[PDB]
């Protein structure tokens, strides 16, 4: 999980719901194009209550729910064809996406530009599986894992990097 495979996207809320993208793996922040107003997540066992008696959304199979029963509209798109006049009422989501399998020679991905040796060792792994030179397996695997952890740490030392955090004293009026 890292940025380069992240994605911005608008949704198409019809009524407090929306269907999940095929390409979705894992979610990070969602909110509105305007004002921010970050959503947070909860379970049905709570949201259903909040219906009986901020924002809350949850996961029902292939569907997203939202309590306050929202409406967003995906952009107006095309016509002359210069921009995507985004819609007011739009909420935007950030989610990690399943990258495409190459299925082509000249094809490429951010990875190779970045960290190919990774792919190299990790596939050599299953190769040395095809034919039983295990010790090589162990070596390849260890190295792949080491590389990978280097990466995630590159990211961790990023995601909070700027200055001392400081826990907010968020207190509502009164």
């Amino acid at each position: 999980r890292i940025p380069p495979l992240e994605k911005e996207v608008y949704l198409d809320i019809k009524d407090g719901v929306a269907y999940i993208p095929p390409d979705y793996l894992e979610a990070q922040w969602m909110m509105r194009a305007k004002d921010g107003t970050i959503f947070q997540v909860t379970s049905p066992e709570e949201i259903s209550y909040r219906r009986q008696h901020p924002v809350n959304f949850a996961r029902f199979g292939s569907r997203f729910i939202f309590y306050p029963s929202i409406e967003a509209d995906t952009p107006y798109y095309p016509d002359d064809g210069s921009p995507l006049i985004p819609a007011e009422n739009s909420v935007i989501l950030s989610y990690y996406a399943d990258p495409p399998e190459f299925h082509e020679d000249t094809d490429t991905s951010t990875i190779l530009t970045i960290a190919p040796e990774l792919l190299l060792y990790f596939t050599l792994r299953h190769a040395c599986l095809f034919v039983q030179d295990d010790n090589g397996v162990q070596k390849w695997s260890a190295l792949g894992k080491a590389i990978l952890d280097e990466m995630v740490e590159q990211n961790k030392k990023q995601e909070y990097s700027g200055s001392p955090i400081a826990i907010p004293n968020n207190m509502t009026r009164l």
Partner: protein, 87 residues
Amino acid sequence: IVYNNQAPDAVNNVGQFGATEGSIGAYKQAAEYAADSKYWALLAESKFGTIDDLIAEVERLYQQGVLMKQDIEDLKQDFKDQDARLM
């Protein structure tokens, strides 16, 4: 100390924001189109800069001055001729 005004040349070979081998064309084409738009806006101030200041000013300025001159000349000529012939 610096600005990020230069043009897209390379791709991140480490760093998980920005350019990849499958996106560099987008950056470069965006830069080209932006520079082309500027070319236009600047040449435009020029045509427009030029057009306006230049011709508009030479036209109006001298027409007005020359037509005032016309009034003056005509008046003078007529008056003089008449009065003198009367003499």
